[PDB]
Symmetry: C4
Subunit: 283 residues, 4 copies
Amino acid sequence: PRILNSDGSSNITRLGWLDDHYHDLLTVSWPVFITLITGLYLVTNALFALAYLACGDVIENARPGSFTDAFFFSVQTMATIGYGKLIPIGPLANTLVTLEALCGMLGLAVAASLIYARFTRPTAGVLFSSRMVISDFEGKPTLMMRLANLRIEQIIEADVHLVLVRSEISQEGMVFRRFHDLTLTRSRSPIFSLSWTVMHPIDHHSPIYGETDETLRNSHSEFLVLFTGHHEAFAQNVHARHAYSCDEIIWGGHFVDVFTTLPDGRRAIDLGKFHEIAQHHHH
Amino acid sequence: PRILNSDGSSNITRLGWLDDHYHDLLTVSWPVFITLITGLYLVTNALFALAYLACGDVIENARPGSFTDAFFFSVQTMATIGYGKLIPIGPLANTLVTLEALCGMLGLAVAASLIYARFTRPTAGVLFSSRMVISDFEGKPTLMMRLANLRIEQIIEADVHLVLVRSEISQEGMVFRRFHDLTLTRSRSPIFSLSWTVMHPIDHHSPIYGETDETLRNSHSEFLVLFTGHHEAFAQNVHARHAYSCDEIIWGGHFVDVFTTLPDGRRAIDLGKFHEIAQHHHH
Amino acid sequence: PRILNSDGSSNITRLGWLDDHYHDLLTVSWPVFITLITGLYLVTNALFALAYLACGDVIENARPGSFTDAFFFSVQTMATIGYGKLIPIGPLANTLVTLEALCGMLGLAVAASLIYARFTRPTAGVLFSSRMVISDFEGKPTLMMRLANLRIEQIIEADVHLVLVRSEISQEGMVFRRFHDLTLTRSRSPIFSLSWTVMHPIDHHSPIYGETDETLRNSHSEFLVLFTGHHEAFAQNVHARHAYSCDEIIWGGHFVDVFTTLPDGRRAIDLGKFHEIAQHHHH
Amino acid sequence: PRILNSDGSSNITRLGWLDDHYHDLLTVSWPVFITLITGLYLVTNALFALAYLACGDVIENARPGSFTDAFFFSVQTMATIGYGKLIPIGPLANTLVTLEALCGMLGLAVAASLIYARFTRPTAGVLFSSRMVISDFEGKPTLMMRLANLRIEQIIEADVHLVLVRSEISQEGMVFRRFHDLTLTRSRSPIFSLSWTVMHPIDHHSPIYGETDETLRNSHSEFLVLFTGHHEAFAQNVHARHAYSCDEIIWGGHFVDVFTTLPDGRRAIDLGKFHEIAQHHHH
Ligand SMILES: [K+]
Ligand SMILES: [K+]
Ligand SMILES: [K+]
């Protein structure tokens, strides 16, 4: 019954048409977006066609009072193909022409921006260790997990937050869900390029100090990771979030090493070891 | 007589043509912007038309010395419909043609950028509690208000500032308006997704320490909220501001709750309760 | 003989073709930029024309072996006017056609970005007090100056740096220019909207502590101001810099006030007072 | 056998098609990118051509059932040249027409964004001293290197990180690589314009305290520099990274000086001295 999913998205039921137009256009699925555009496209040409007929027989080589001919003319026009069979006749015809044109291009201008706006979304090539572990490092138990960059490009002034979420009681006895930042031995990495193992020493200041497994389940406590940085690939900021549940903490585990020396004597990164955690089994 | 409005915009009278072109173009109302563009469009084609006539009878199938014909030709040319009735004749005609073309597309290039520049502005889907309250939490009064995210998308590394603005006297006796940043128990929320109740404990460090209602009116003091964060919807930064007056502080009040358990046993959010503040009435 | 000019640009002599293409294109003056584009435009069409002639007589209604005809055809083709007199003939002709097209639009795509890149530069509407003053505020002498926003739109997350630059001697006796950032009583203003008077208290920590005028001239010391913030007008970041020399510090001065109460009882801003500094003259 | 290259890119062997489409498109060499686009272009027109043939003889003046004719028609249609020889016939023909158009325009919209996305990348004009030096400044040994801005434009709120990377042993005996950010006497420069000599005093807090050369080689330790700032040239953020190996530290060296006084008495910047380091040779 987790508040937060693994993908980091909160897991709640929300209780609530043209109001949020811009958001909605960037939020819709590509199929839909393309449809909408199409609809709009067809629609407006039809409208324009009617305008033509309305004037009445103002297009060269158009079957009299036929909406198709006018429509297709309108596309050839708006789109500025301007084949040349169907042509404006008389001031009224042409004014509508020079109006459509402008309309068409403006639409392109609007479509473009939407496209570009929705199209230009980078994604940190970042991979999260499927598990956390609690184990002794430098003489104090420490909670860790690790990120691997999935691309050759580097992430600059990357940094990460390790947030514990769990239930608490106020002195007043309000029983709420609280967020605790957890101090990391290293929270900034100005140049993140291969792997980073993040650590929260556990000492008298850690909100998870002297806590067993039993106690963690009991506060229904999870761990939320937010990573962010400036990706050289995109020359644009990127982020990535992940969440862990009490039971994805492997007590005493140790992340295996992904750094190797080749036969060649050249260093290397093996991603295969990335999700592997060493463990002592005591029968 | 408030210095700051609810929308957070300061409430002062300011005492002060082509100077600020770029700002103005992004600042104008869409109707106006479109008009301007249109004007510019029509205008330039007229100019071009004149250029054509000026050469004299250089367009196929054009009524001799008729501006309309030239004008409409110019549009068909500059929008590159290029129907094909009206056509250039001779070097002068065509040079003007190849000039217009380029002109037209440059205009598109300029129009586009403006459009995109004005078009691409997100808005945090954030709603502010209409009131603040001063109530005891964990043993110290605390001033609070709360934000609710209005969209399914999440806001990352969101954070908020609670600023008290009020009149003061210097030892030197300068009577000025000063801004105090009020320490919040929680000022960052790396993953804002549903509701956030912001709190400023009031203790010997709070500029509103041991202050009643009477004293607040007296310094003509208001409270300004700035919220900001990176919206996943837009993959871009968003902000929202709000302001409160002394009298929108509900002393002793408690925000009602918005988190529920369904019959189903599934957690939920209710945004009807959002503006509701519990209160004790003592006859 | 100032190191820094009033406009904040350093005042030094620097001692040093296709290398910096992108910078150069954004750095050039509009006339020039347009020329370059034009040149490129004309040029490429000429090249294309030659390609056509090179096939030989492959365009309908073209005077045999005539470059003009080919050239103008090439424009009508690359701008996609496609009038319809001059037309491709045979495979070679048309392939070149379908190649040009693509070329043309790609050029548009490149031109656009440049245009937009150079076009979309905001400027903080910020005005700097022409002078600084040193005077007692809240019981310690304080250096100050002030900014006024020149537009109705607000600046978010605005903040400012007050940097003293002056010559120093190392224990080793290196005589260098050093920068001292000066602690301001208020360095962030999450919502800058009208005027902000920035202050650097002078106490045992101020690098200008117990310094007279004489001593300031002597270290040839100046004061550099950098302001930056996110402008709601442009929905984009803005900055502004300014510099002051030792002699633009008005000792004992006090900035006059720009905030008024109207007859109406409505508050107001008078930016005429903005540069005015009160002063005591003692015969 | 360095972990990090001079360009700051980590020097490891990574061990691991349509997955990363957007990154890949921005990452590919211009030649390749253009090819891809071209391919896509040609391809889609061919597809469209087939669509035409498939209806069968629906284009005016088209050799019956010939792909070339259809193909070239398709381009004239999709690029909206619309010459006018080949023309749609009947409903099926034209619908495909009005579909292509839109398609073409959308492609432009997509191409543009890619172009602009890849095209609009600035590069800090920043040059790194080829060497570092360890030498006494103001009475404590200090590690330094220096940056020179290579362009007339200025970089705002520039700042730099000096990171030591070297192998260590945990008490638990884990032998890992660790990063130490090294406190710099000056880490921000709100207005970087000519040269900046960065310094890390070495004292009881420096992770390189009481370390000789021998000891540095031994921990296989390098030094990583990240510089970043907002470039006025591009009105956009820029960064630059560099790395140094133990052996590019010139002990006792002193950077020569690049600031000069002209005969004219005007100050100047010479960048020939930039890489020059003074040294005492003791036979
Ligand atoms: K056309
Ligand atoms: K066209
Ligand atoms: K045509």
